[PDB]
Coordinates of C-alpha atoms and ligand atoms in Angstrom, one line a residue:
Chain A
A2 CA 0.0 0.0 0.0
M3 CA 1.0 3.6 -0.5
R4 CA -0.9 6.8 0.5
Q5 CA -1.3 9.4 -2.2
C6 CA -1.6 12.9 -0.6
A7 CA -1.8 16.4 -2.1
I8 CA -0.9 19.7 -0.4
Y9 CA -3.0 22.5 -1.8
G10 CA -3.4 26.2 -0.8
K11 CA -3.0 29.7 -2.1
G12 CA 0.3 31.0 -3.4
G13 CA 2.9 31.9 -0.8
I14 CA 1.0 30.2 2.0
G15 CA 3.7 27.7 2.8
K16 CA 2.9 24.6 0.7
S17 CA 6.5 23.8 -0.4
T18 CA 8.1 24.6 2.9
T19 CA 5.5 22.5 4.8
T20 CA 5.6 19.6 2.3
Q21 CA 9.4 19.3 2.2
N22 CA 9.7 19.5 6.0
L23 CA 6.9 17.1 6.6
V24 CA 8.4 14.6 4.1
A25 CA 11.9 15.0 5.6
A26 CA 10.3 14.1 9.0
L27 CA 8.7 11.1 7.3
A28 CA 12.0 10.0 5.8
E29 CA 13.6 10.4 9.2
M30 CA 11.0 8.0 10.6
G31 CA 11.9 5.4 8.0
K32 CA 9.2 6.1 5.3
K33 CA 9.9 6.0 1.6
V34 CA 8.4 9.1 0.0
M35 CA 8.2 10.8 -3.4
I36 CA 7.4 14.5 -3.9
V37 CA 5.8 15.5 -7.2
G38 CA 5.9 19.3 -7.8
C39 CA 2.7 20.6 -9.4
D40 CA 3.3 24.3 -9.2
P41 CA 4.8 26.3 -12.1
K42 CA 7.2 28.0 -9.6
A43 CA 9.0 24.6 -9.7
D44 CA 10.9 25.0 -6.5
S45 CA 9.0 22.3 -4.5
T46 CA 12.0 19.9 -4.2
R47 CA 15.0 22.2 -3.8
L48 CA 15.2 21.7 0.0
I49 CA 15.4 17.9 -0.4
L50 CA 17.9 18.2 -3.3
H51 CA 20.1 21.0 -1.7
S52 CA 19.6 22.7 -5.1
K53 CA 18.5 25.9 -6.8
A54 CA 15.5 24.0 -8.0
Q55 CA 15.0 21.0 -10.3
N56 CA 14.8 20.8 -14.1
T57 CA 11.2 20.0 -15.0
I58 CA 9.6 17.2 -17.0
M59 CA 8.4 19.8 -19.5
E60 CA 11.9 21.2 -19.9
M61 CA 13.5 17.7 -20.0
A62 CA 11.0 16.3 -22.5
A63 CA 11.7 19.2 -24.8
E64 CA 15.4 18.5 -24.8
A65 CA 14.9 14.8 -25.3
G66 CA 12.4 15.3 -28.2
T67 CA 9.4 13.5 -26.7
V68 CA 8.3 12.5 -23.2
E69 CA 8.8 8.9 -24.5
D70 CA 12.5 9.6 -25.0
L71 CA 12.7 10.4 -21.3
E72 CA 13.8 7.7 -18.9
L73 CA 12.4 7.7 -15.3
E74 CA 15.8 7.0 -13.9
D75 CA 17.1 10.2 -15.6
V76 CA 14.1 12.3 -14.2
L77 CA 13.6 11.3 -10.6
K78 CA 16.3 12.6 -8.2
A79 CA 16.9 11.5 -4.7
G80 CA 18.0 13.8 -1.8
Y81 CA 17.7 14.0 1.9
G82 CA 16.6 10.7 3.5
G83 CA 16.3 9.1 0.1
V84 CA 13.2 11.2 -0.8
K85 CA 12.6 11.1 -4.5
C86 CA 11.7 14.3 -6.3
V87 CA 10.3 15.4 -9.6
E88 CA 8.9 18.7 -11.0
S89 CA 6.2 19.0 -13.6
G90 CA 6.9 22.4 -14.9
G91 CA 4.5 24.3 -17.1
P92 CA 4.3 26.7 -20.0
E93 CA 5.6 30.2 -19.8
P94 CA 3.3 33.0 -18.7
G95 CA 0.8 34.0 -21.4
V96 CA 1.4 30.7 -23.2
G97 CA -1.4 28.0 -23.0
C98 CA -2.7 26.6 -19.8
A99 CA -0.5 27.1 -16.7
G100 CA -1.4 23.6 -15.4
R101 CA -0.8 21.6 -18.6
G102 CA 2.6 20.2 -17.3
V103 CA 0.9 18.5 -14.3
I104 CA -1.1 16.2 -16.6
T105 CA 2.0 15.3 -18.7
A106 CA 4.1 14.7 -15.6
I107 CA 1.6 12.5 -13.7
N108 CA 0.9 10.4 -16.7
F109 CA 4.6 10.0 -17.4
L110 CA 5.2 8.9 -13.8
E111 CA 2.4 6.4 -14.0
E112 CA 3.4 4.8 -17.3
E113 CA 7.1 4.6 -16.4
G114 CA 6.4 2.7 -13.1
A115 CA 7.3 5.4 -10.6
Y116 CA 4.7 4.2 -8.2
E117 CA 6.8 1.3 -7.0
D118 CA 5.3 -0.9 -4.2
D119 CA 8.0 0.2 -1.8
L120 CA 6.8 3.8 -1.6
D121 CA 4.9 4.7 1.6
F122 CA 3.7 8.1 0.5
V123 CA 3.5 10.4 -2.5
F124 CA 3.0 14.1 -2.0
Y125 CA 1.8 16.4 -4.8
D126 CA 2.5 20.1 -4.1
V127 CA -0.2 21.8 -6.1
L128 CA -1.0 25.4 -6.9
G129 CA -4.4 26.2 -5.4
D130 CA -5.4 29.8 -6.4
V131 CA -7.5 28.3 -9.3
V132 CA -9.0 24.8 -9.4
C133 CA -8.9 24.0 -13.0
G134 CA -6.8 22.4 -15.8
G135 CA -3.9 20.3 -14.5
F136 CA -4.2 21.9 -11.1
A137 CA -7.6 20.1 -10.7
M138 CA -6.3 16.9 -12.3
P139 CA -5.1 15.3 -9.0
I140 CA -8.7 15.7 -7.7
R141 CA -10.6 15.1 -11.0
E142 CA -8.7 12.0 -12.0
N143 CA -8.4 10.5 -8.5
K144 CA -4.6 10.8 -8.1
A145 CA -4.5 12.1 -4.5
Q146 CA -6.8 10.5 -2.1
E147 CA -5.9 12.7 0.9
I148 CA -6.0 16.4 0.4
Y149 CA -4.3 18.6 3.1
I150 CA -4.8 22.4 2.7
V151 CA -2.3 24.8 4.1
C152 CA -4.0 28.0 5.1
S153 CA -3.8 30.8 7.7
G154 CA -6.2 33.3 9.3
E155 CA -5.9 35.4 6.1
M156 CA -9.3 35.6 4.4
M157 CA -7.7 34.8 1.0
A158 CA -6.2 31.6 2.4
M159 CA -9.5 30.5 4.0
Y160 CA -11.3 31.4 0.7
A161 CA -8.8 29.2 -1.2
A162 CA -9.4 26.3 1.3
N163 CA -13.1 26.7 0.7
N164 CA -12.6 26.7 -3.1
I165 CA -10.5 23.5 -3.0
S166 CA -13.1 21.9 -0.9
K167 CA -15.8 22.8 -3.5
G168 CA -13.6 21.0 -6.1
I169 CA -13.4 17.9 -3.9
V170 CA -17.2 17.9 -3.6
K171 CA -17.7 18.2 -7.3
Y172 CA -15.8 15.0 -8.0
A173 CA -17.1 12.9 -5.0
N174 CA -19.4 10.8 -7.2
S175 CA -16.3 8.9 -8.5
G176 CA -12.9 8.0 -7.2
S177 CA -12.0 8.5 -3.5
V178 CA -10.5 12.0 -3.2
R179 CA -11.2 13.3 0.3
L180 CA -10.3 16.3 2.5
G181 CA -7.8 15.1 5.2
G182 CA -7.3 18.2 7.1
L183 CA -6.3 21.9 7.3
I184 CA -2.7 22.9 8.3
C185 CA -2.5 26.3 9.8
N186 CA 0.8 28.0 8.8
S187 CA 0.8 30.7 11.4
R188 CA 0.9 34.5 10.6
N189 CA 1.6 35.0 14.3
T190 CA -1.8 36.5 14.9
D191 CA -4.0 36.0 18.0
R192 CA -6.7 33.3 18.0
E193 CA -5.5 32.1 14.6
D194 CA -5.4 28.5 15.8
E195 CA -9.0 28.8 17.1
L196 CA -10.1 30.4 13.8
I197 CA -8.7 27.5 11.7
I198 CA -10.1 24.9 14.1
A199 CA -13.5 26.6 13.6
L200 CA -13.1 26.6 9.8
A201 CA -12.2 23.0 9.8
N202 CA -15.2 22.1 11.9
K203 CA -17.5 23.9 9.5
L204 CA -16.0 22.1 6.6
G205 CA -16.2 18.8 8.4
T206 CA -12.5 18.2 8.8
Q207 CA -9.9 19.0 11.4
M208 CA -6.9 21.3 12.0
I209 CA -4.3 18.6 11.8
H210 CA -1.5 20.9 13.0
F211 CA -0.7 24.5 13.8
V212 CA 2.8 25.3 12.3
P213 CA 4.4 28.3 14.1
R214 CA 6.1 31.1 12.3
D215 CA 9.8 30.6 13.0
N216 CA 12.9 32.3 11.5
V217 CA 14.9 29.0 11.5
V218 CA 12.9 28.2 8.3
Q219 CA 14.6 31.2 6.5
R220 CA 18.0 30.2 7.9
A221 CA 17.5 26.6 6.7
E222 CA 16.2 27.7 3.3
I223 CA 19.1 30.1 2.6
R224 CA 21.2 27.0 2.9
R225 CA 18.8 25.0 0.6
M226 CA 17.7 22.7 3.5
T227 CA 14.7 21.6 5.4
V228 CA 14.7 22.5 9.1
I229 CA 14.7 18.7 9.8
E230 CA 18.2 18.5 8.1
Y231 CA 19.5 21.9 9.0
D232 CA 18.9 21.8 12.7
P233 CA 17.4 18.5 13.9
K234 CA 17.2 19.9 17.5
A235 CA 15.2 23.0 16.6
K236 CA 11.8 23.5 18.1
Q237 CA 10.4 23.9 14.6
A238 CA 11.9 20.5 13.6
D239 CA 9.8 19.0 16.4
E240 CA 6.7 20.8 15.0
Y241 CA 7.2 19.2 11.6
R242 CA 7.7 15.8 13.3
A243 CA 4.4 16.3 15.1
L244 CA 2.6 17.2 11.8
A245 CA 4.2 14.1 10.1
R246 CA 3.1 11.8 13.0
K247 CA -0.5 13.1 12.8
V248 CA -0.6 12.7 9.1
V249 CA 0.6 9.1 9.4
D250 CA -2.0 8.4 12.1
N251 CA -4.9 10.3 10.4
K252 CA -8.0 8.3 9.7
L253 CA -10.5 11.2 9.1
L254 CA -11.0 11.7 5.3
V255 CA -14.3 13.4 4.5
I256 CA -16.3 14.9 1.7
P257 CA -16.2 18.4 3.0
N258 CA -19.1 20.9 3.5
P259 CA -18.1 24.2 1.7
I260 CA -19.4 27.3 3.4
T261 CA -20.7 30.6 2.2
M262 CA -18.8 33.9 2.1
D263 CA -21.2 35.0 4.8
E264 CA -19.9 32.2 7.0
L265 CA -16.3 33.0 6.2
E266 CA -16.8 36.7 7.1
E267 CA -18.6 35.6 10.3
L268 CA -15.6 33.4 11.3
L269 CA -13.2 36.3 10.7
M270 CA -15.4 38.7 12.8
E271 CA -15.8 36.3 15.7
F272 CA -12.1 35.6 16.2
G273 CA -11.2 39.3 16.2
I274 CA -8.7 38.8 13.3
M275 CA -10.0 42.0 11.6
Chain B
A2 CA -9.9 59.4 -25.1
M3 CA -10.0 56.9 -22.3
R4 CA -7.2 55.0 -20.5
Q5 CA -7.6 51.3 -20.1
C6 CA -5.7 50.1 -17.1
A7 CA -5.4 46.7 -15.4
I8 CA -4.4 45.9 -11.8
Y9 CA -2.7 42.5 -11.5
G10 CA -1.0 40.7 -8.7
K11 CA -1.1 37.6 -6.6
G12 CA -4.1 36.6 -4.6
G13 CA -4.6 38.5 -1.3
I14 CA -2.0 41.2 -2.2
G15 CA -4.5 44.1 -2.2
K16 CA -5.7 44.4 -5.8
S17 CA -9.4 45.1 -5.0
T18 CA -8.8 47.3 -2.0
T19 CA -6.2 49.3 -3.9
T20 CA -8.3 49.5 -7.1
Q21 CA -11.5 50.6 -5.5
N22 CA -9.8 53.2 -3.3
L23 CA -7.7 54.5 -6.3
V24 CA -10.9 54.7 -8.4
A25 CA -12.8 56.5 -5.6
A26 CA -10.0 59.1 -5.5
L27 CA -10.3 59.5 -9.3
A28 CA -14.1 60.0 -9.0
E29 CA -13.5 62.5 -6.2
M30 CA -11.3 64.4 -8.7
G31 CA -14.0 64.5 -11.3
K32 CA -13.1 61.5 -13.4
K33 CA -15.6 59.0 -14.9
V34 CA -14.4 55.5 -14.2
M35 CA -15.6 51.9 -14.7
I36 CA -14.3 48.9 -12.8
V37 CA -14.4 45.5 -14.5
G38 CA -13.9 42.6 -12.0
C39 CA -11.8 39.8 -13.5
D40 CA -11.2 37.7 -10.5
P41 CA -13.5 34.7 -9.6
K42 CA -13.6 36.0 -6.0
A43 CA -16.0 38.5 -7.5
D44 CA -15.9 41.1 -4.7
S45 CA -14.0 43.7 -6.7
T46 CA -16.8 46.3 -6.7
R47 CA -18.4 45.8 -3.3
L48 CA -16.8 48.9 -1.7
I49 CA -18.1 51.2 -4.5
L50 CA -21.6 49.6 -4.4
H51 CA -21.9 49.4 -0.5
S52 CA -22.8 45.8 -1.1
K53 CA -22.0 42.2 -0.2
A54 CA -20.6 41.8 -3.8
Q55 CA -22.2 42.0 -7.2
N56 CA -24.0 39.4 -9.3
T57 CA -21.8 38.4 -12.1
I58 CA -22.3 38.4 -15.9
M59 CA -22.0 34.6 -15.9
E60 CA -24.7 34.3 -13.2
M61 CA -26.9 36.9 -14.9
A62 CA -26.5 35.5 -18.4
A63 CA -27.5 32.1 -17.0
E64 CA -30.8 33.4 -15.6
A65 CA -31.6 35.4 -18.7
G66 CA -30.8 32.5 -21.0
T67 CA -28.1 33.9 -23.2
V68 CA -25.7 36.8 -22.9
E69 CA -27.6 38.3 -25.8
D70 CA -30.7 38.5 -23.5
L71 CA -28.8 40.6 -21.1
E72 CA -29.0 44.4 -21.3
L73 CA -26.1 46.6 -20.4
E74 CA -28.3 48.9 -18.4
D75 CA -29.3 45.9 -16.2
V76 CA -25.7 44.8 -15.7
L77 CA -23.6 47.9 -14.9
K78 CA -24.3 49.3 -11.5
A79 CA -23.1 52.7 -10.3
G80 CA -22.0 53.5 -6.8
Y81 CA -19.8 56.0 -5.0
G82 CA -18.9 59.0 -7.1
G83 CA -20.8 57.6 -10.1
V84 CA -18.2 54.8 -10.6
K85 CA -19.7 52.1 -12.8
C86 CA -19.1 48.5 -11.8
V87 CA -19.4 45.0 -13.3
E88 CA -18.2 41.5 -12.3
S89 CA -17.2 38.8 -14.8
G90 CA -17.6 35.8 -12.6
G91 CA -16.3 32.4 -13.5
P92 CA -17.1 28.7 -13.3
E93 CA -17.2 26.8 -10.1
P94 CA -14.0 25.2 -8.8
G95 CA -13.2 22.0 -10.7
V96 CA -15.4 23.0 -13.6
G97 CA -13.7 24.3 -16.8
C98 CA -11.3 27.2 -17.0
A99 CA -11.4 29.6 -14.0
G100 CA -10.8 32.6 -16.4
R101 CA -13.5 31.8 -19.0
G102 CA -16.0 34.4 -17.6
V103 CA -13.5 37.3 -18.2
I104 CA -13.6 36.6 -22.0
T105 CA -17.4 36.6 -22.0
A106 CA -17.6 39.7 -19.9
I107 CA -15.2 41.9 -21.8
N108 CA -16.7 40.9 -25.2
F109 CA -20.2 41.6 -23.8
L110 CA -19.1 45.1 -22.6
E111 CA -17.5 45.9 -25.9
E112 CA -20.5 44.8 -28.1
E113 CA -23.1 46.5 -25.9
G114 CA -21.3 49.9 -26.0
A115 CA -20.0 50.1 -22.4
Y116 CA -16.9 52.0 -23.6
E117 CA -18.7 55.3 -23.9
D118 CA -16.6 58.3 -24.9
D119 CA -17.3 60.0 -21.6
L120 CA -15.3 57.5 -19.6
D121 CA -11.9 58.7 -18.5
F122 CA -10.6 55.3 -17.1
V123 CA -11.4 51.6 -17.1
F124 CA -9.8 49.5 -14.5
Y125 CA -9.7 45.7 -14.8
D126 CA -9.0 43.9 -11.5
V127 CA -7.4 40.7 -12.6
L128 CA -6.3 37.5 -10.8
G129 CA -2.5 37.2 -11.4
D130 CA -1.4 33.9 -9.8
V131 CA -1.5 32.3 -13.3
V132 CA -1.2 34.1 -16.6
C133 CA -3.4 32.1 -18.9
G134 CA -7.0 31.7 -20.2
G135 CA -9.2 34.7 -19.6
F136 CA -6.7 36.1 -17.0
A137 CA -4.2 36.6 -19.8
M138 CA -6.9 38.0 -22.2
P139 CA -6.5 41.7 -21.2
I140 CA -2.9 41.4 -22.2
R141 CA -3.2 38.9 -25.1
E142 CA -6.1 40.8 -26.7
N143 CA -4.8 44.3 -26.1
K144 CA -7.6 45.3 -23.7
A145 CA -5.6 47.1 -21.0
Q146 CA -2.8 49.3 -22.2
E147 CA -1.5 50.2 -18.8
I148 CA -0.7 47.3 -16.4
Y149 CA -0.1 48.2 -12.7
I150 CA 1.1 45.4 -10.5
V151 CA 0.3 45.4 -6.8
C152 CA 3.1 43.5 -4.9
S153 CA 5.0 43.6 -1.6
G154 CA 8.4 42.5 -0.3
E155 CA 7.1 38.9 -0.2
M156 CA 9.0 36.7 -2.6
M157 CA 5.7 35.3 -4.0
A158 CA 4.4 38.7 -4.7
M159 CA 7.6 39.7 -6.5
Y160 CA 7.6 36.4 -8.4
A161 CA 4.0 37.1 -9.6
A162 CA 5.1 40.6 -10.7
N163 CA 7.9 39.0 -12.7
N164 CA 5.5 36.4 -14.3
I165 CA 3.0 39.1 -15.3
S166 CA 5.9 41.0 -16.9
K167 CA 6.8 37.9 -18.9
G168 CA 3.3 37.8 -20.2
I169 CA 3.5 41.5 -21.2
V170 CA 6.8 40.8 -23.1
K171 CA 5.3 37.7 -24.9
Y172 CA 2.6 39.9 -26.5
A173 CA 4.6 43.0 -27.2
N174 CA 4.8 42.2 -31.0
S175 CA 1.2 43.3 -31.3
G176 CA -1.1 45.7 -29.5
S177 CA 0.2 48.3 -27.0
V178 CA 0.0 46.6 -23.6
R179 CA 2.8 48.0 -21.4
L180 CA 3.9 47.9 -17.8
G181 CA 3.0 51.2 -16.1
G182 CA 4.4 50.6 -12.6
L183 CA 4.6 48.6 -9.4
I184 CA 2.4 49.5 -6.4
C185 CA 3.9 48.4 -3.1
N186 CA 1.2 47.4 -0.7
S187 CA 3.2 47.4 2.5
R188 CA 3.6 44.5 4.8
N189 CA 5.1 46.9 7.4
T190 CA 8.6 45.5 6.9
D191 CA 11.9 47.4 6.9
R192 CA 13.4 48.5 3.5
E193 CA 10.3 47.3 1.7
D194 CA 10.0 50.5 -0.3
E195 CA 13.7 50.3 -1.4
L196 CA 13.2 46.6 -2.3
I197 CA 10.2 47.3 -4.6
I198 CA 12.0 50.4 -6.1
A199 CA 14.9 48.2 -6.9
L200 CA 12.7 45.5 -8.4
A201 CA 10.9 48.1 -10.5
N202 CA 14.3 49.4 -11.8
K203 CA 15.4 46.0 -12.8
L204 CA 12.1 45.5 -14.7
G205 CA 12.5 48.9 -16.3
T206 CA 9.4 50.5 -14.6
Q207 CA 8.9 52.5 -11.4
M208 CA 7.4 52.1 -8.0
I209 CA 4.5 54.4 -8.6
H210 CA 3.4 54.5 -4.9
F211 CA 4.1 52.9 -1.6
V212 CA 0.7 52.2 0.1
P213 CA 1.1 51.9 3.9
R214 CA -0.6 49.2 5.9
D215 CA -3.4 50.9 7.8
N216 CA -6.2 49.5 10.0
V217 CA -8.6 52.2 8.7
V218 CA -8.9 50.0 5.6
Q219 CA -10.4 47.2 7.7
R220 CA -12.8 49.6 9.5
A221 CA -13.9 51.0 6.1
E222 CA -14.4 47.6 4.6
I223 CA -16.4 46.2 7.5
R224 CA -18.8 49.0 6.5
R225 CA -18.5 48.1 2.7
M226 CA -16.8 51.4 1.9
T227 CA -13.6 52.7 0.5
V228 CA -11.4 54.7 2.9
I229 CA -12.1 57.7 0.5
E230 CA -15.8 57.6 1.3
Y231 CA -15.5 56.2 4.9
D232 CA -13.1 58.8 6.3
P233 CA -12.1 61.4 3.7
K234 CA -9.7 63.0 6.3
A235 CA -7.7 59.8 7.0
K236 CA -4.0 59.7 6.3
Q237 CA -4.7 56.6 4.2
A238 CA -7.2 58.5 2.1
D239 CA -4.5 61.0 1.2
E240 CA -2.2 58.0 0.3
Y241 CA -4.8 56.8 -2.2
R242 CA -5.2 60.3 -3.6
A243 CA -1.4 60.5 -4.1
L244 CA -1.5 57.1 -6.0
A245 CA -4.4 58.3 -8.1
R246 CA -2.6 61.6 -9.0
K247 CA 0.5 59.7 -10.0
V248 CA -1.5 57.3 -12.1
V249 CA -3.2 60.3 -13.9
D250 CA 0.2 61.9 -14.5
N251 CA 2.1 58.8 -15.4
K252 CA 3.9 58.8 -18.8
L253 CA 6.2 55.8 -18.4
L254 CA 4.8 52.7 -20.1
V255 CA 7.4 50.1 -21.0
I256 CA 8.0 46.7 -22.3
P257 CA 9.5 45.2 -19.1
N258 CA 12.7 43.3 -18.6
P259 CA 11.8 40.1 -16.6
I260 CA 14.5 38.9 -14.3
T261 CA 15.8 35.5 -13.2
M262 CA 15.1 33.8 -9.9
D263 CA 18.7 34.4 -9.1
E264 CA 18.1 38.2 -9.4
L265 CA 14.9 37.9 -7.3
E266 CA 16.8 36.1 -4.5
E267 CA 19.6 38.6 -4.7
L268 CA 17.2 41.4 -4.2
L269 CA 15.7 39.7 -1.2
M270 CA 19.1 39.1 0.3
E271 CA 20.3 42.6 -0.2
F272 CA 17.4 44.4 1.5
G273 CA 17.6 42.2 4.6
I274 CA 14.0 41.1 4.2
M275 CA 15.0 37.5 4.9
Ligands
ADP1 N1 6.4 28.2 9.4 C1 7.1 29.1 8.7 N2 8.0 29.9 9.4 C2 8.7 30.8 8.7 N3 8.7 31.0 7.4 C3 7.9 30.3 6.6 C4 7.1 29.2 7.2 N4 6.4 28.6 6.3 C5 6.7 29.2 5.1 N5 7.6 30.2 5.3 C6 8.2 31.0 4.3 O1 7.2 31.5 3.5 C7 7.6 31.6 2.1 C8 6.6 30.9 1.2 O2 6.5 29.5 1.5 P1 6.4 28.4 0.4 O3 6.3 27.1 1.1 O4 7.4 28.7 -0.7 O5 4.9 28.8 -0.2 P2 4.1 28.2 -1.4 O6 4.8 26.9 -1.8 O7 2.7 27.9 -0.8 O8 4.1 29.2 -2.5 C9 9.0 31.0 2.1 O9 10.0 32.0 2.1 C10 9.1 30.2 3.3 O10 10.4 30.1 3.8
ADP2 N1 -3.1 49.1 2.7 C1 -3.8 48.2 3.4 N2 -3.9 48.3 4.7 C2 -4.6 47.5 5.5 N3 -5.2 46.4 4.9 C3 -5.2 46.1 3.6 C4 -4.5 47.1 2.7 N4 -4.6 46.6 1.5 C5 -5.3 45.5 1.5 N5 -5.7 45.2 2.8 C6 -6.5 44.1 3.2 O1 -6.0 42.9 2.6 C7 -7.0 42.0 2.3 C8 -6.8 41.5 0.9 O2 -7.0 42.7 0.0 P1 -7.7 42.5 -1.4 O3 -7.6 43.9 -2.1 O4 -9.0 41.9 -1.2 O5 -6.7 41.5 -2.2 P2 -6.9 40.8 -3.6 O6 -8.0 41.6 -4.3 O7 -5.5 41.1 -4.3 O8 -7.1 39.4 -3.4 C9 -8.3 42.7 2.6 O9 -8.8 42.3 3.9 C10 -7.9 44.1 2.7 O10 -8.8 44.9 3.5
SF4_3 S1 -7.3 29.5 -15.7 FE1 -5.3 28.9 -16.7 S2 -5.8 28.2 -18.8 FE2 -7.8 28.2 -17.6
SF4_4 S1 -4.7 27.0 -15.5 FE1 -7.0 27.2 -15.3 S2 -7.9 25.9 -17.0 FE2 -5.7 26.4 -17.5
MG5 MG1 5.7 26.3 -3.6
MG6 MG1 -9.7 41.0 -5.2

């Protein structure tokens, strides 16, 4: 068995930092993981690979001629803890659909046997500001059974979580894609944990972890490293270990209950965030 | 003559708050303005209309049968200072292309004569996290000659500004779409103004205004109002008046010079933001 998970959320919310640190913690535990980058920013694997970023399947297929001329062993790269890494890529801005590389990449990985029985987890790191094209494909085509949404007390981040949840509902008649939890990536605001707990309850899920804002993240990332590798004794490393443990142990996977803008605004007003 | 302007930027950066306040300041000056909402969030006109939001062209065409059964005078709504307002709308998450409503809306406005000679400005408020589909249409189809990008010292906001600039470059062989400036919507961080000035210089544009972070915005918006209308004496009202004046007087419209991720990271490192 292997658990296919996707991390969604609005841009800049902390998807890639949270995913790579969570996965490093899983590898530290003994799990075999692969990360599939599904964001055109294409820096979703750099902290595992100690790298600037990673060359993308779209880039690599173009140099090889066709995606058929690519070999999986040339594409997947292993970094910290043996974690395997790949980036989808996408067309340049203003050219075609920003999500088109995700479809090509996931199909390539499936055909070439990347989903080896020894893997324990796959994590897709997916742009979540729009839920369409290749960005919706992990949900529409039943690729990620467990969706975790990174958000914060920011209205836009909660709105994005609600929109992703609407996408999950739309495809619930087929497949088994479910909402597994919200991850609050703290803005260091008061009552933010309570706000995200309340949002999760309205959606029917849970706040699986509250990730604190901590400067050690920036110091690790300047050195192209997860906190797990950079400073295994840091408080923040233990936070990512707690998130990883709760993901491993999580059994709540629901069809969520999207809320109205009225309910979103009411949540914001109640917890004094405004 | 009328100047067609578009406000782009990543989600949550301040596009709609900045646009509606800028436009209220223009109306206060005596300008005739229309705002075209091009973001699926569809709350780009609520502060002009004193409203929850505005029903969208996609919603309204569906109830009327066809977009041909819609009348412009039923669609455009006027609020503070006579500013005219319309929302494109878009499909639900997971359904088709998130930007498809923008194409329908702009074509409807053009055919129905919305671009009356008496208008001084049109502002499109456009989602900027992906530059594709209907979100690229104002650039691809030469609808907004002057692009202003709202950003901040946040790496993701600067990355988005760079991506939008790449879209402008891609279509520079036709039409007259140009980058008019960056608007820094402050995160209250040190050297943020200098950082955005430096980014603008590398792109070949300017920082047209630094908008401070000010709680009066939240107090105005709780009451569904621009700061201009809510408290015309507020310091922040004068900030939006300064932005509006500089937009009116701006003559620098360039084909920008997009930068590398290496240059973006170097900017961040230099100004001590990290
Ligand atoms: N818990 C945290 N503490 C401190 N900084 C963080 C934290 N989470 C994310 N960041 C910083 O926020 C920025 C954006 O995070 P990232 O994961 O790249 O977002 P996304 O992938 O959602 O666009 C990065 O500079 C990252 O280092
Ligand atoms: N200069 C500012 N000072 C205080 N709050 C602001 C400012 N600009 C924006 N905001 C707040 O930031 C949030 C997001 O702004 P908004 O314009 O809706 O972003 P976007 O349209 O880019 O998604 C809103 O709650 C808004 O009130
Ligand atoms: S939103 Fe991007 S192409 Fe449809
Ligand atoms: S990105 Fe949305 S549909 Fe192409
Ligand atoms: Mg990322
Ligand atoms: Mg907006």
